[PDB]
Design an enzyme around this catalytic site. Structure first.
Site, PDB file in Angstrom:
ATOM      1  N   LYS A 182      -4.224  10.101  63.032  1.00  0.00           N
ATOM      2  CA  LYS A 182      -5.210  11.336  62.792  1.00  0.00           C
ATOM      3  C   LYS A 182      -5.351  11.882  64.061  1.00  0.00           C
ATOM      4  O   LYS A 182      -6.393  11.684  64.807  1.00  0.00           O
ATOM      5  CB  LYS A 182      -6.431  10.519  62.054  1.00  0.00           C
ATOM      6  CG  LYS A 182      -6.162   9.903  60.633  1.00  0.00           C
ATOM      7  CD  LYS A 182      -7.523   9.333  60.194  1.00  0.00           C
ATOM      8  CE  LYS A 182      -7.342   8.029  59.730  1.00  0.00           C
ATOM      9  NZ  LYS A 182      -7.341   6.955  60.934  1.00  0.00           N
ATOM     10  N   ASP A 214       5.795  14.690  53.551  1.00  0.00           N
ATOM     11  CA  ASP A 214       5.943  13.838  54.338  1.00  0.00           C
ATOM     12  C   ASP A 214       7.322  13.504  54.901  1.00  0.00           C
ATOM     13  O   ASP A 214       7.752  13.329  56.208  1.00  0.00           O
ATOM     14  CB  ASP A 214       5.696  12.367  53.759  1.00  0.00           C
ATOM     15  CG  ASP A 214       4.301  12.003  53.631  1.00  0.00           C
ATOM     16  OD1 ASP A 214       3.267  12.810  54.120  1.00  0.00           O
ATOM     17  OD2 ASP A 214       3.833  11.241  52.766  1.00  0.00           O
ATOM     18  N   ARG A 236      -7.876   6.653  72.254  1.00  0.00           N
ATOM     19  CA  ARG A 236      -7.953   5.248  72.566  1.00  0.00           C
ATOM     20  C   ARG A 236      -7.395   4.903  73.920  1.00  0.00           C
ATOM     21  O   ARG A 236      -7.180   3.593  74.248  1.00  0.00           O
ATOM     22  CB  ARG A 236      -7.339   4.406  71.379  1.00  0.00           C
ATOM     23  CG  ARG A 236      -7.887   4.618  69.977  1.00  0.00           C
ATOM     24  CD  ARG A 236      -7.223   3.843  68.937  1.00  0.00           C
ATOM     25  NE  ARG A 236      -7.648   2.208  69.270  1.00  0.00           N
ATOM     26  CZ  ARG A 236      -7.383   1.387  68.327  1.00  0.00           C
ATOM     27  NH1 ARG A 236      -6.876   1.614  66.958  1.00  0.00           N
ATOM     28  NH2 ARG A 236      -7.829   0.217  68.422  1.00  0.00           N
TER      29      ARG A 236
END
EC number: 2.8.3.21
Lengths: 407, 407
Positions: B99, B171, B106
């Site tokens: 996302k 996708d 992180r």
């Protein structure tokens, strides 16, 4: 020599790569031109007496043929064939779209190509492949036919109305696959020094793209139903819905998502039942007896609410959704604006043209638009000079009808 | 050392290439696994406590995860992060689907990745891109949302019912684009020795795929209408039609093609008129006053004829057409049979699995299926040993919950 090269800015991951393509319309040229979006030198071959039929299109070719060099040469006839095969000697990748093994029929086999350049990566794009049966192998390539032949068409559309994916979806998947495969073969060349021939059959491309549910059919289960008005074939509250002032797509997934949505739509009493137990994360519309009722109540709640109201409410409940944007709504969208997703460039004839930027975005070596679509035969003279032809030689080709230079 | 490698047959254009992917479901893993179809060593990373949600699917993952090595590692936490970054030191291409810029959030920025391997090609797949506005950049990636946001959804479907392309079309386009772009960046590495970061935003991928008519909107013309029951938005006798015993796609293009078809369908008297002059090659349904009448008579003629009859007649007149094949009709089709387009292989648990062969077909270095989908953490121990971890080290990771080995 060092002076014998086509001028263009050095940029992109593919700077210095030499690509040539033979073909018209979408599939083949899309494959070839993608290399040019990312910095390659790409030569677009057109016939002498007739140009690429893409040129009939009023605006699209300004996007689909940007960043290209234009050669007009009869690659199958006499001195034109000699010129083409000479060009192959310094070409890294050759892409062609044909009705089956048409090149081999006309005497330009892979064997002949490798005689001139043993390193050459050759990509053959066709509807039905380079080999097979006499009945199918030499048939015309069309996007609709590829979708029909691959099982893609039958799974698109409405319950009682199949439709093809739009626009020309199979042409884009097939062209993109050719780019991918050629780049993969290129990797192998840089270690072994030996080229490759790639047989890209449009129906096999589309076969792969339609496997998500077809794999159930092949392995003992059932093929999925077609969507009903863009709703998920299996899962309630997923897919396309109609609001008061337009369409939204949504994903009713999660415990609290289902719990609070049900409350909103007047179905609180369905929660905690054997049919929808405590902790339900996903509603299977066929398996759940309440499936149709959930849809009825969801439709009704959304029908009386605006997209802004729905988005606001779905944001509160963490339900993933998006308005189905109409084409007029794209340019002013804040994400499009921030990312310069739609940009402008200059055509060869002095006009500002609007269209998508380079995608995707490379960080260190970004693509750029360095030239508008060229005219028929615009770079013929430069290309032929670079590969050793004199002005007299080129004149001879033009008079013989084997080449066309600039307008 | 020479003994520290994952065993697999040497094949394909991508033999010896080291690819690692982090992501679930379709887009990211599709991008990663394509490398494995063509010979690369591809490591599929799964979380420790939960496996890839693709595994819930009953059959598809046997195709979508074949030829893969399975690592189960917490790549963001303590010794697991150390292990992941060590792995990066010998990795050529890293693909991740997140996302937005979740990796950077992180602590695994591109800068950190390049500290461990300056040559690394990094592909970031997201719904809305690695940068942009606060509102859109960190939103979830869904195929339907990408279609909605890009103007793809609004142009698919029926006149008064838009629908998304199926199944999960966005996708596949986005994943394929990531493969393509990573292979392009790989080329640049083999000369400069410097890696790349690629920002693949699903909506920008789909924006490009929907340009054929949208380029008219951007450049002073009009956006096309949606298809009516799979018929071409502009040209009569083109697209999807219903016969007596199923559907066909057709292309009514050409002088004799229009002349003789008109005769068959009872419209001979329309030939040689100002509306359809002698030499007409294409009928514009909106511009031609007879457009609707042509459709009425075409529908009626096809409705009372079988596909075999239509195909026979269209073959006589050189009108390109194809039956819309249902899924049960693919395996026995002579072209599919000749090309082995659908094949079989063995799963890791001893069962014959059916599905598409490798596509496309490389001549010199063909792809093959060398292993079925692996289990959760199946190759963790081998991978960690190869990059320098002892049995005791691996045990420590497993007990700390930072890795999972074989079931």
């Amino acid at each position: 020599s060092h002076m014998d090269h086509l001028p263009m800015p050095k940029f992109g991951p593919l700077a210095g790569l030499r690509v040539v393509f033979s073909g018209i319309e979408i599939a083949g040229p899309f494959a070839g031109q993608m290399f040019a979006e990312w910095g390659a030198e790409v030569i677009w071959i057109e016939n002498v007496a007739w140009a690429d039929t893409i040129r009939v299109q009023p605006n699209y070719p300004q996007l689909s043929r940007r960043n290209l060099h234009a050669l007009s040469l009869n690659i199958f006839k006499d001195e034109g064939r000699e010129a083409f095969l000479k060009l192959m000697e310094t070409t890294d990748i050759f892409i062609e779209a044909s009705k089956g093994p048409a090149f081999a029929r006309r005497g330009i086999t892979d064997e002949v190509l490798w005689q001139h350049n043993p390193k050459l990566v050759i990509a053959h794009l066709s509807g039905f492949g380079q080999y097979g049966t006499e009945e199918y192998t030499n048939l015309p390539a069309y996007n609709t036919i590829a979708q029909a032949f691959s099982g893609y068409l039958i799974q698109n559309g409405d319950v009682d109305q199949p439709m093809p994916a739009f626009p020309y979806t199979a042409d884009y998947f097939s062209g993109l696959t050719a780019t991918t495969a050629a780049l993969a073969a290129l990797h192998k060349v840089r270690e072994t020094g030996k080229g490759e021939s790639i047989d890209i059959a449009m129906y096999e491309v589309m076969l792969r793209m339609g496997q998500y549910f077809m794999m159930d059919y092949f392995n003992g289960g059932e093929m999925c139903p077609r969507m009903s008005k863009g709703k998920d074939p299996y899962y309630a509250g997923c897919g396309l819905y109609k609001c008061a002032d337009g369409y939204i797509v949504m994903e009713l997934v999660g415990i609290t998502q289902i719990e609070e949505c049900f409350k909103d739509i007047g179905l609180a009493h369905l929660l905690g039942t054997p049919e929808i137990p405590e902790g339900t994360q996903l509603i299977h519309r066929i398996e759940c007896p309440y499936g149709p009722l959930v849809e009825e109540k969801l439709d009704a709640w959304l029908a009386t609410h605006t997209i802004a109201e729905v988005k606001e409410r779905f944001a509160e409940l963490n339900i993933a959704c998006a308005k189905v944007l109409t084409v007029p709504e794209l340019e002013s969208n804040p994400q499009y604006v921030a990312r310069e997703s739609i940009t402008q460039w200059q055509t060869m004839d002095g006009r500002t043209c609007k269209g998508p930027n380079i995608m995707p975005k490379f960080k260190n070596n970004p693509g750029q638009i360095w030239r508008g679509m060229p005219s028929h035969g615009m770079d013929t003279a430069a290309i032929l000079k670079n590969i050793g032809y004199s002005e007299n030689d080129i004149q001879e080709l033009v008079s013989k009808g084997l080449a066309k230079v600039e307008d």
